[PDB]
Write an enzyme that holds these catalytic residues in place. Structure first.
Site, PDB file in Angstrom:
ATOM      1  N   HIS A 134       0.836  -1.212   0.000  1.00 44.26           N
ATOM      2  CA  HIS A 134       0.000   0.000   0.000  1.00 44.26           C
ATOM      3  C   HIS A 134       0.864   1.253   0.000  1.00 44.26           C
ATOM      4  CE1 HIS A 134      -3.927  -2.119   1.001  1.00 44.26           C
ATOM      5  NE2 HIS A 134      -3.065  -3.013   1.513  1.00 44.26           N
ATOM      6  N   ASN A 143      -9.997  -2.838   3.182  1.00 45.23           N
ATOM      7  CA  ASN A 143      -9.781  -2.831   1.733  1.00 45.23           C
ATOM      8  C   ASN A 143     -11.106  -2.544   1.018  1.00 45.23           C
ATOM      9  OD1 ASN A 143      -6.962  -3.319   1.685  1.00 45.23           O
ATOM     10  ND2 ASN A 143      -7.176  -5.537   1.383  1.00 45.23           N
ATOM     11  N   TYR A 179       1.966  -4.837  12.070  1.00 40.42           N
ATOM     12  CA  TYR A 179       1.826  -3.390  12.005  1.00 40.42           C
ATOM     13  C   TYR A 179       2.565  -2.680  13.136  1.00 40.42           C
ATOM     14  CZ  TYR A 179      -1.949  -4.203   8.588  1.00 40.42           C
ATOM     15  OH  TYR A 179      -2.725  -4.634   7.555  1.00 40.42           O
TER      16      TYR A 179
HETATM   17  C1  HDD Z   1       1.185 -10.439   8.114  1.00 48.55           C
HETATM   18  C2  HDD Z   1       1.248  -9.343   7.378  1.00 48.55           C
HETATM   19  C3  HDD Z   1       0.047  -8.678   6.841  1.00 48.55           C
HETATM   20  C4  HDD Z   1      -1.228  -9.227   6.443  1.00 48.55           C
HETATM   21  C5  HDD Z   1      -1.706 -10.646   6.465  1.00 48.55           C
HETATM   22  C6  HDD Z   1      -1.991  -8.064   6.001  1.00 48.55           C
HETATM   23  N1  HDD Z   1      -1.299  -6.905   6.063  1.00 48.55           N
HETATM   24 FE1  HDD Z   1      -2.007  -4.997   5.728  1.00 48.55          FE
HETATM   25  N2  HDD Z   1      -0.172  -4.263   6.089  1.00 48.55           N
HETATM   26  C7  HDD Z   1       0.922  -4.954   6.574  1.00 48.55           C
HETATM   27  C8  HDD Z   1       0.970  -6.293   6.822  1.00 48.55           C
HETATM   28  C9  HDD Z   1      -0.104  -7.248   6.578  1.00 48.55           C
HETATM   29  C10 HDD Z   1       2.128  -4.090   6.907  1.00 48.55           C
HETATM   30  C11 HDD Z   1       3.441  -4.578   6.282  1.00 48.55           C
HETATM   31  O1  HDD Z   1       2.349  -4.090   8.341  1.00 48.55           O
HETATM   32  C12 HDD Z   1       1.640  -2.705   6.476  1.00 48.55           C
HETATM   33  C13 HDD Z   1       2.597  -1.822   5.632  1.00 48.55           C
HETATM   34  C14 HDD Z   1       2.498  -0.403   6.175  1.00 48.55           C
HETATM   35  C15 HDD Z   1       1.838  -0.567   7.496  1.00 48.55           C
HETATM   36  O2  HDD Z   1       1.606   0.273   8.339  1.00 48.55           O
HETATM   37  O3  HDD Z   1       1.447  -1.913   7.678  1.00 48.55           O
HETATM   38  C16 HDD Z   1       0.266  -2.992   5.884  1.00 48.55           C
HETATM   39  C17 HDD Z   1      -0.451  -2.021   5.299  1.00 48.55           C
HETATM   40  C18 HDD Z   1      -1.879  -2.049   4.987  1.00 48.55           C
HETATM   41  C19 HDD Z   1      -2.687  -0.899   4.571  1.00 48.55           C
HETATM   42  C20 HDD Z   1      -2.245   0.516   4.349  1.00 48.55           C
HETATM   43  C21 HDD Z   1      -2.534   1.380   5.576  1.00 48.55           C
HETATM   44  C22 HDD Z   1      -2.135   2.793   5.180  1.00 48.55           C
HETATM   45  O4  HDD Z   1      -2.839   3.395   4.340  1.00 48.55           O
HETATM   46  O5  HDD Z   1      -1.099   3.293   5.709  1.00 48.55           O
HETATM   47  C23 HDD Z   1      -4.014  -1.402   4.381  1.00 48.55           C
HETATM   48  C24 HDD Z   1      -5.262  -0.667   3.990  1.00 48.55           C
HETATM   49  C25 HDD Z   1      -3.869  -2.799   4.739  1.00 48.55           C
HETATM   50  N3  HDD Z   1      -2.604  -3.182   5.022  1.00 48.55           N
HETATM   51  C26 HDD Z   1      -5.032  -3.665   4.761  1.00 48.55           C
HETATM   52  C27 HDD Z   1      -4.984  -5.097   4.971  1.00 48.55           C
HETATM   53  C28 HDD Z   1      -6.181  -5.927   4.883  1.00 48.55           C
HETATM   54  C29 HDD Z   1      -7.585  -5.497   4.619  1.00 48.55           C
HETATM   55  C30 HDD Z   1      -5.660  -7.246   5.131  1.00 48.55           C
HETATM   56  C31 HDD Z   1      -6.372  -8.537   5.174  1.00 48.55           C
HETATM   57  C32 HDD Z   1      -7.593  -8.595   5.687  1.00 48.55           C
HETATM   58  C33 HDD Z   1      -4.241  -7.067   5.344  1.00 48.55           C
HETATM   59  N4  HDD Z   1      -3.878  -5.779   5.283  1.00 48.55           N
HETATM   60  C34 HDD Z   1      -3.372  -8.167   5.611  1.00 48.55           C
END
Ligand code: HDD
Ligand code: HDD
Ligand SMILES: [Ca+2]
Ligand SMILES: [Ca+2]
Ligand SMILES: [Ca+2]
Ligand SMILES: [Ca+2]
Ligand SMILES: [Ca+2]
Ligand SMILES: [Ca+2]
Ligand SMILES: [Ca+2]
Lengths: 673, 671, 354
Positions: B62, B135, B349
């Site tokens: 993202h 999402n 996160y």
């Molecule tokens: C195990 C790891 C993992 C999994 C399974 C998911 N994500 Fe995630 N997500 C992350 C690890 C992550 C992250 C690497 O931790 C991020 C990158 C930037 C942040 O803050 O967290 C992230 C970012 C991130 C953002 C951007 C937030 C922003 O605008 O700053 C969104 C909207 C989502 N994710 C949504 C989801 C949804 C709806 C998931 C499933 C239902 C999901 N993620 C599963």
């Protein structure tokens, strides 16, 4: 050349980073529908790594791509420089080169209009030597302290981060019009040099005057120019815009593919060489990075061959992590007092701390030298070395006085050119010798062909029409008018303002060789150029025609794509995914004439590929003898330059290949009266 | 607000260093006028050091996105279902910040890539920050968080050459999808118009996971979050999205910025589906499984409140780039479930913000701060912005009188885990058999789309799979698609010259569900903000007059009108050179401009006609105000969403109905 | 304290640098090193590093950015922010400016000025300016440290350098390490002295406020605690920090003998009611006497208050007529004498000289 650091995972069981065999597909849970356990180390080590994969993008030139290769010296250049990599005929040195845009972030499009980077590392037997250059020989600004001003103005507006990878917004043109030094680079960026056809079809420039220093201490002033052996070529703007959407990776893919096919790109590494006494002899100051030395005043000397012939194994480890510095200098080269160069020296050492997150960035495989390191640098985050010398200070007796000091007279040390001096007040003042911001932009404009001048005018009309501020637009016209009244009038016409009265202070009619793309003649080679053959699956004869054409074109090193409604043996791409931006020339087989509606591609797609290719100046044609249906549908005249119609495959290909070398048929573009 | 306190004004004043010393910053200090720069030039080095360190790592996923401020207002006192304070009174207002995004592309990639989209909402509540990190698609590709790097590696660019940017149209992505059948449901959503939304304002938000609402009495219910757009649902068509990616990479962020600046801030009804704990397995699938929706026929939506975004950021980096969301930002009244995807997110996160921020005090950044006092014994760390007065930061203490006090179900409004939750069984790395049906719900989704919508989805798959080089991967893809629908496999196979495998009817069915189709969701409820391009000419005063008459009317109706001509002047907004059909939702040619549609150094050959023709092909309402233009464009005069009137008022009325219809889908060929 | 990030680059209008090559390089180091400490470029935003006046500049972004900048045109020259911030210099806006008389001339060189070459005359000036016992302490510090150097070559090289400052220093140091000093080399020898560098010669302290007095007492005798309380009152009146030490704590007793040490005091007084202390499970054998003996050896004022001093002083081998040794029955008379001793601070007659 980095084989020792490669890790193979073509066999074996999954392990942790400490070699314990593990799995990584299911979390450990308290029961089959239970919560995940904190003691699941397999989960946490994998996700922690993923969570930390990213590093800061480069502050500028974030978007780019690289390759490995070799530099070969043409001679023993000891009579002009002590540089070891230049000290014998045929001497080879490994290189790594990264090409880039300037303004866009990671993931922005290759085919944005921009200045481009061309950064070369020579892994020499007396240390790494970097030439961190661009595809344009002059820079926007005259003092390094102004770099954040330039870059903030061209990068997206900081409230909304709009627009990406573009100078077409108020702040950039505000800066250009308030800082007239920018005019020379601006004219270059608004020419075809802002939208090169590929990294292989542009040159590289060190921009600054540097010094070559002999072992006797004598020095000469030099400019670096890497001259492409592939020729000079540009996109047209409307094509570049479409390509930015259809293939953001166009330049990196072009380079990757040329190397994989054994067509690795080549440049003659050249210098202009002049005496120290000629620093102000040419009507401008050689310390001023907004000025070129016209080739009529100082010819190019060819030093050796740069060839890129090996793609990286891991993009992140090699291309993303390569950390160039103009401070990576070797004995035989020195700096000049160009105030832009001077401040760069500080920036590139400092910025690698941001990218790497610690001070041991020269230990990354891609940054390591190919010779031993002997110094007293110790510790720091990420320290990979285990130093044996327990007395890392100078002067010492407890390590017998080692490492020894290297200098002009011992140990092949780097040394500052000994004729260099300074004199005068300690000042924050600009030299009046830097004050002519307009004559050289005019020299450049005068050296372009009429259609090339039209393209440059049109790029300015495009960008300035998107500037909202009427004050900024007026200020832009004031500056353009100082270079050329005609440019100001023609640009003004598109934006509904009047040009200011002619101001002839800096007008002249001089021209210089080697800066025009359109005037550089046909390409010296057509190997790697892309031919799209538009066919149909409806007619077995059309597929036969396409196959015959493919054989005849591939023989000459062209990359052939046969397009049809659906994939099968001999068809590379569907109409749905095909676009004219994917080709340097387009051929329709006459068996496919009927295509020129279906659920398999957008309405009118086959004809649109042909029409776009024609309208963008490419060689186009129909092979087979029946051409009127296709040409009439496309509104393309059969007798047009760069339009081909032959029954004979052999004769068609002969003619078409001449058109590929011509590359662009410029008579298809309208000119201001 | 922490954001107000930290605003810095530079509309007046002399330049200073970061420590308040007045300085200059335009010329380096040199030993002589043509001399070398001095190391003692602190003005140079502080400025350049700052510049050299401006960048931070982009988000791991993202990375490309844009944000805005707004307010959430509760419709009721929801104490009957949750203890959550922000939901505890009719009309209660809580500030919010929302970031929208794609998933795979890096931070400079195009908004209109085909992708899943993020919709992350922070509620700055009076009992702590609460984030719903959602999402625009209600189901996720994978069933366990440990697989996230596998998914993301496969969809991101190939790691030898970093090609292709922001696209699933490559071997590795389809290799993963075809080997990991859980991906089918989200894949179908991404291949529909949901992968290419018209704007952030024309998409919904989903929490994806089942969560719990927990009452003060300790009882709990299972919930799904659904933010329902008040702007309607709308998509681009694929070819339009591709052109847009090149012509305007900032399309969605610009659309959002502009809607807010014009007083047309987007709104969503924040809703939940609410079901009993006993219904975790009652709907024919497991509510712990993030690849499944609860069909609305089984559980209707309850509207909890209104989310409105109505203020743009002041500094994008400080606010949008630095906002650090976490599903771990939870408040009393909400709890987690044992969804193994959600469970692992909680870890990720908190950890990843260390990478982005470079230190542990990221919750002190103004955009991350809460709007209530912080009382805890967290201390020190790089970038510590507080000066803590409590010199005894340990529990239990007497030397600070036992403060801060522990908060729990019965003290200080503490968060508490839903007390009915239990665990039982072996400690296992095993997948629940209840998660095994990967194909029925993708088929439910596909069945629920209109015929042209099904065609678009098939065509998206034809496009992407035709770019997969491996014959083996392509065959494996057909194997999986065939388990969802034989017809889909047959139609996709036709484009790639392969034979579809024989029908396998295990998971085939004819059931449909409401609320998932874009094409079937009816006309848009408002046309405010939609874009009308008026193609005119400077050569006829009548043309400019016609354009001005149209503008007056259309603008009072909230439309954004762009008059296009050869050159700029009074009343003309854009030149033909910079104009494109992707810049408009509807296109009108004024009849005085007919000659342009029949060469100029002012725009590319055939540009005026190409704008009209593209707009028509892409299904937009198009018209001529004031036969020849329609003939040149091969546009049938009697076509649906084709307008031809001499009366401006009549034209505006009819064209506005066309804008609400939004896309005229009869212009697309069907298998 | 941990986060304060100092820089000689934090300079203001009215001050400038010189071409001292040590100073010149410092300017680079302190800006760079804060990146290591802070982990990011916004270290001037930490509260302890912030200025007390407004900041107007075009620095931006970076990890840990705490500001929300309103100016969306952060470049110079601009018109879109009306040319703000304005440049500050000698003539406008109270800008910093480099001293305008400063110049440079000559070759660009990595050479040391020959004007820097006398490394020995000023060390000798400093040594000459110390008192005899102060010179002894300095010799003794060198004898201590150099005796721990294992390399005989390094020790010889050290004597070679010391000898260029003073032959006598080299001889006296060499004596402790079993080497011979090299022959006198008088190139840099001289007899000149300078004021204000000697500690021993700087005279009595101008104030004794905050100085620490340990009163050694006993719980065995109610009279000893009474003496200690009277002394405490008299000493505290003058701003001295008083610690009463006894075997165990109780009201009026601050420290036990177990935790007490002569290094905790600037002067030590034994109350004569405690004379018997001068073995127990409550402190190490001989601890009370050791405190008194250490205080005396280290040059501190020491005394016995109450009238009966011979038992304590004899046990400590401290002469009753010694400078900085006190004995009085009168608390008033004791304190008046003792306070003069605290100002003298150190009784240097107690240290042997070569
Ligand atoms: C195990 C790891 C993992 C999994 C399974 C998911 N994500 Fe995630 N997500 C992350 C690890 C992550 C992250 C690497 O931790 C991020 C990158 C930037 C942040 O803050 O967290 C992230 C970012 C991130 C953002 C951007 C937030 C922003 O605008 O700053 C969104 C909207 C989502 N994710 C949504 C989801 C949804 C709806 C998931 C499933 C239902 C999901 N993620 C599963
Ligand atoms: C004072 C600051 C400053 C100035 C005046 C310049 N640059 Fe620079 N340049 C940087 C500060 C910088 C930087 C911030 O230090 C970068 C970012 C990534 C890096 O390693 O250095 C950089 C990156 C960078 C790259 C990318 C190297 C790569 O591929 O990794 C190229 C090709 C250039 N620059 C070329 C130039 C040229 C030809 C200049 C004018 C003659 C120039 N730069 C002026
Ligand atoms: Ca702008
Ligand atoms: Ca060109
Ligand atoms: Ca760090
Ligand atoms: Ca030197
Ligand atoms: Ca791939
Ligand atoms: Ca759709
Ligand atoms: Ca100055």
């Amino acid at each position: 050349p980095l084989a020792a650091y490669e890790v193979d995972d073509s066999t074996g069981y999954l392990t942790s980073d400490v070699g314990g065999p593990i799995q990584d597909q299911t979390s450990l849970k308290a029961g089959i529908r239970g919560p995940t356990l904190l003691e699941d180390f397999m989960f946490r080590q994998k996700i922690q790594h993923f969570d930390h994969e990213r590093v800061p993008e480069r502050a500028v030139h974030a978007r780019g791509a690289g390759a490995h290769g070799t530099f070969t010296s043409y001679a023993d250049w000891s009579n002009i420089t002590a540089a070891s990599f230049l000290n014998a005929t045929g001497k080879q040195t490994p290189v790594f080169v990264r090409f880039s845009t300037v303004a866009g972030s990671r993931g922005s499009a290759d085919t944005a209009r921009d200045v481009h980077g061309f950064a070369t590392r020579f892994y020499t037997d007396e240390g790494n030597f970097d030439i961190v250059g661009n595809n344009i020989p002059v820079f926007f600004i005259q003092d390094a302290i102004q770099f954040p001003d330039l870059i903030h103005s061209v990068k997206p507006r900081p409230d909304n981060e709009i627009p990406q990878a573009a100078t077409a917004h108020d702040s950039a043109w505000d800066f250009f019009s308030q800082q007239p030094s920018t005019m020379h680079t601006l004219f270059w960026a608004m020419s075809g040099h802002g939208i090169p056809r590929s990294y292989r079809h542009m040159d590289g420039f060190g921009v600054h005057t540097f010094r070559f220093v002999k072992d006797d201490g004598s020095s000469k002033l030099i400019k670096w120019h890497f001259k492409s052996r592939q020729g000079k070529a540009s996109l047209v703007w409307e094509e570049a815009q479409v390509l930015s959407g259809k293939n953001a990776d166009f330049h990196r893919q072009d380079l990757w593919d040329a190397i994989e096919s054994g067509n690795g790109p080549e440049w003659d590494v050249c210098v202009q060489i002049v005496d120290e006494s000629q620093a102000q002899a040419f009507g401008f100051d050689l310390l001023d990075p907004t000025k070129i030395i016209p080739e009529e005043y100082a010819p190019l000397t060819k030093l050796g061959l740069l060839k890129l012939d090996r793609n990286p194994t891991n993009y992140f480890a090699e291309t993303e992590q390569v950390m160039f510095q103009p401070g990576h200098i070797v004995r035989g080269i020195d700096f000049t007092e160009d105030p832009l160069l001077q401040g760069r020296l500080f920036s590139y050492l400092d910025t690698q701390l941001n990218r790497n997150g610690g001070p041991n960035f020269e230990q990354l495989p891609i940054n390591m030298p190919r010779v031993p390191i002997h110094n007293n640098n110790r510790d720091g985050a990420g320290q990979m070395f285990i130093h044996r010398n327990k007395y890392p200070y100078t002067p010492n007796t407890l390590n017998s006085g080692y490492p020894r000091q290297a200098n002009q007279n011992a140990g092949r040390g780097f040394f500052t050119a000994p004729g260099r001096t300074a004199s005068g007040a300690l000042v924050r003042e600009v030299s009046p010798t830097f004050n002519d911001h307009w004559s050289q932009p005019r020299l450049f404009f005068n050296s372009l062909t009429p259609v090339e001048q039209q393209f440059l005018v049109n790029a300015m009309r495009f960008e300035i029409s998107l500037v909202k501020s009427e004050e900024v637009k007026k200020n832009v016209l004031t500056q353009l008018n100082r270079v050329s009244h005609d440019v100001a009038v023609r640009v003004a016409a598109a934006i509904g303002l009047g040009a200011p009265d002619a101001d002839d202070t800096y007008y002249h009619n001089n021209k210089t060789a080697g800066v025009s793309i359109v005037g550089s003649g046909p390409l010296p080679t057509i190997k790697t150029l892309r031919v799209g053959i538009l066919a149909t699956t409806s007619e077995s004869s059309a597929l036969d025609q396409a196959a015959q054409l493919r054989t005849r074109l591939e023989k000459d090193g062209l990359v052939v794509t046969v397009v049809a409604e659906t994939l099968r043996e001999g068809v590379d791409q569907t109409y749905s995914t095909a676009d004219a931006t994917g080709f340097d020339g387009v051929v329709v087989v006459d068996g496919a004439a009927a295509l020129f509606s279906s659920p398999l591609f957008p309405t009118g797609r086959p004809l649109q590929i042909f029409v776009d290719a024609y309208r963008w100046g490419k060689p186009v044609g129909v092979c087979g003898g029946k051409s009127s249906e296709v040409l009439d549908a496309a509104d393309v005249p059969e007798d047009g330059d760069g339009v081909y119609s032959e029954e004979s495959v052999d004769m068609f290909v002969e003619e078409f290949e001449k058109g590929l070398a011509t590359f662009r048929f410029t008579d298809r573009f309208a000119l201001d009266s």
